[PDB]
Structures are given as C-alpha cells and as structure tokens.
Amino acid sequence: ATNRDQESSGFAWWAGNARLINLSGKLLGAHVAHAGLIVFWAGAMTLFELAHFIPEKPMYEQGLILIPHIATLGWGVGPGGEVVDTFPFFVVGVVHLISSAVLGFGGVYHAIRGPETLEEYSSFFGYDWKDKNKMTTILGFHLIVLGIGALLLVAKAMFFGGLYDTWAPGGGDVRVITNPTLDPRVIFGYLLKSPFGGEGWIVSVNNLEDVVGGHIWIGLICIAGGIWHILTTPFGWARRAFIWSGEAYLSYSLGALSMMGFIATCFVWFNNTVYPSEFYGPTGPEASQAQAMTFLIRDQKLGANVGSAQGPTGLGKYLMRSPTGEIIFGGETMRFWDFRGPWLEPLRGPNGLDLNKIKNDIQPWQERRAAEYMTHAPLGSLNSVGGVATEINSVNFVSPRSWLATSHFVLAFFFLVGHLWHAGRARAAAAGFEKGIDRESEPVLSMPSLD
Amino acid sequence: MTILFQLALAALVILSFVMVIGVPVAYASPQDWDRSKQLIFLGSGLWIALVLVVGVLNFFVV
Amino acid sequence: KLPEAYAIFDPLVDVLPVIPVLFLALAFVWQAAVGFR
Amino acid sequence: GGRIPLWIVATVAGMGVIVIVGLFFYGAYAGLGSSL
C-alpha cells in the first residue's frame, strides 16, 4: 500500500486526504468521486422535493430549495409563479442522478484502480504543483468551462424560453430577455456600489436584463482570462507574491469560496429578483413592509386618514419620511424603506409612497399579496414552527430564505476558517517550520531581547 | 408498453445495486481481475442501455 | 408527485438524498477495518 | 479473544445507536409530545 499509513506518509488517518497531495491520479479520483456526490445530491434532492411537492401550495410553504432554482430558470411555471408542468423538475433530477453514477464510476476508478500518479501516464494530465505554467493552464481550461457555463444561462434566457421575471408587466411571468444590458457603466457600476443600506452592491440587481448582460460579460471575461492563462506564465510580481504549492492553491480557493458563500447569503436574504418571492417566499424586509401595508389597507377601509395618523411617538403611524424625505411606511419597518417589490412599486410616486394612489389604487391582488407575505415572514424555529419564538405550535413553516441564508453563513464561515488554516500551513510548510521549531536553530534565541 | 417500463426500471434498480457493490470489490481485488473486467464492461454497457430504455419508455408511459 | 408510473419507487426516493451522508460514515468504517493506520 | 473484528462490532453498535436516536427523533413528530 503506497502512502496509506502514517509512517510512510507523515499524516495520521484523520489527516488522511493530505496523503494525496502528490498522488495526482488518486487525487483526481477523489475530486471526480466528490463531484459525483454533489451531482447525486442535486438529483436525489430534486426527486425527493418533487415526490413531496404539492402543486396547489406555494413552493416556499413546502421546504423546497432546488425546485425554486429550476422554476426561476423558466421551467415548469406560468404567470405569477404557478406550476403548470412538473415534468422539467423530474428531468433535472433524473439526469443529475444518472450523471452522478458516471462521475462516481470514474472517481472510484481513478481512486482505487487507475494509476496513482498521472505524471508517467501523460504529460498533459500529469502536473507538479510547483509547475506554475502548468497550473495556469489547468486554471485556464477551467475558466473557459465556467465561462461557457455562464453563457448557458444567457442561452436559456435569450434563446430557450427565458427566465421567470417577477417584475414583468401584469404580474410575474417567464419572459425571454431580448435586450441584455451590455453597457459596462451599468454592469461594472454594480461592482462599485456600496454594500450598505439602500445600495446593496451586486445584491441590488433588480432586472433580468442586467442579470443576463452581466453573465454575458462574465462568460466572455472568463473565456478571455482562460485563454490568457493558457498562453502566459505567471509574471515576476505574481511569483514573488504567492506561495506556489498544492495546499496554497487550496487555501486561495477557500478564501474565494468563503467570500462567495457570504455573498450568496445576502443574495438569498435581500434579493427578490433572482430569488423570486413567489418561489422563495417574501424577504425579511418584504414581509415587514407587507404588514404595514396590510394594516394601512384595513384601517383605511375602516375610515382612517392614513397620511395624518400619528403613532404613539408622534411619527406617522402608517406613513413617515425616510432620512432623505421619501414617503415610507411607518413603525419599525422604517428600516426597510429601501425594499422594492412588484406588489408595492405601483403605489410609489416620485416622492415615495403616493397618498392619492394609496387612497384610490390599491388592488385586491395587492391586498392578498400583502397578507400572504406578512403571514409568511422568514421567522421560524429550528423545529420548523413558523412565526416568532413566542408562537404556539400550529404552522409548519421556515422560509427557504432562512434555510438558505443560515446554511450558507455557516458554510462561508468555516471556509473562512479553512482558508486561515490552509493559508497559514502552506506558508509555514513552504518556509519549512510547519512541524515545529528546530531545537538547534530556534529563531527567537538569535534575536535581541525586547527589553 | 405498460409492464415493460417498471420491470426495466426495477431491473435498473437491481443492476445498479450489483454495480454499486460489485465494482469496488472488483477494482480492489487485483488478483482475479481479468475475469472481473468483462463483468464490469458488461454491466457498464448494460446499465447505460437500461437508462436509455427507461428514458425511451417514459414517453409511452407518461 | 413523481409521474404516476414511478409511484412504486417513492419509498426509495424518500431515502435517496441521505446517501451522501453515508459516504462520510463509510470512510470511518473502512478506516476502522484497516485499524486507522 | 479475537473472533469478531472490532470494526464490525463498532459498525453494528454505531448503527444501533443511530436507529435508536432516529426512533426518538421519529417520536418527536408522532404520538405524545408531537403537538398534534
């Protein structure tokens, strides 16, 4: 057995995957088999979700997280997010579940049967971690693959049916995107926006033309950078800046994945465009706004003058001003005045919420939507009791947004921890002190005392 | 056909179970291995032919 | 629901997503059988 | 002394624990204490 015990490999059983650092064939098998696990879960979960899926309930009432992703891509849904065809969800699950067997077979093959290292079998497939030019070549292949993957989303949106547009005129509907936003002052303008409130960085993207046009820019950037990395070698400043080792490249990815995990947590929590509320439930801000609207509507129907009602503090009970003068809902939801949603935007004028439209133009579909969203706020217990912590058992509800945000915060955090673990270790291992201080040349004993 | 669908799907379930056990036990026994590659080559191509059978017969059963 | 022809595999589908978790556990079984060397 | 491999004992005992705790989690949703 080659490198399969601690004495030969230097790593204990619980650090057992580190025995694969220089065994590229077994390491390839680890990765392909793990890719099979990911594809298996995507397949097995979708089929689980579909087997449980009641078509007459909203998706967010059903503890589904994958079916909403498919519905957002345009498959299976009609106007307002209602499900018209369960069969695309079945196909996505099945095809993932079958492809996981192929990835699983090739992972297991290279892990246990095939050559332990690839460097003798092939010069193209073998690699040294220290071979900087080979590393950029594999990086370049993978960038081209990811860039085509972004263009697939563009292909679906433009030439294969469209995407679910929650902002479409007349209600949410699957809409083909014909004019994506190509202009880089808009696309790269999102990158320069503040992440703070009212701004939201890239999380505030609020139309599918910007989403699609960004993915055009990303696909071409990734293909161009892919080609660039196949044709160049890391410049001198890059070679002096980085650690060039397998553990170091892993650490760099862990830093990147953690950052992406944190961004996804915010995307699912705040964005109702690529995470439509008809599939994922209302956002936290959306439900709080929906409550103020609901009681505005009820109280106005009873005869209340809503623009002139004082709350207990003296601020307007239903309506007040934001710190820049826009007319906004009152109460605690004053914090969420930057919320924008297709059920609320028809009440907004130039100065914010228009009081004449509020008096005259609230439709019954908005009243139903506000009540539905207020009663499906992303608040629930770990045993899936919906509502505040003080609520009784009855409602079985935790919003997908809560499940998705909490999970991805947890994952992003530990991946930050992993980045710090592996980045520190790769630094120490490259400098040669990862196993401890050498008793003969202890560095601190050669230093002058601090005092 | 009606009975042909689930029977071939229950064949695909059964055969996947022989492939899930039998493939790592045959890749990790390199002694009597030339006799096991044929059953791997057979079971692999038989499995792929059953996915296509289930996939084709889905569109007469659904 | 699954397409109605597939309705006998519902008990199998119900347990499919947990199968990845068993792979993690399986690595501990395999290591126990080699004695964690 | 060394009849049954300790890994087999560990695995069956480990799985016996899972089944028993999984039953207790099943009982959280059924019968007494389920809120239904």
Binding site: - | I21, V25, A28, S29 | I19, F23, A25, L26 | -
Partner: peptide, 27 residues
C-alpha cells in the same frame, strides 16, 4: 417500505468493506 430501503442501502457500504476484508482486498 421506507425502513427496508434504508436497511438495504445502509448495509451495502459495510458489505463492500466486509467483502474486501474476506478476500484480502486492497483496502
């Protein structure tokens, strides 16, 4: 129905290990 599928799936992993343990496999 559900309890017997998880039992047959839950034994397939340990059976791979046990079968390679008895044939002196490459564990």
């Amino acid at each position: 129905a559900q309890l017997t599928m998880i039992a047959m799936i839950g034994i397939a992993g340990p059976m791979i290990i046990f079968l390679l343990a008895v044939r002196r496999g490459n564990l």
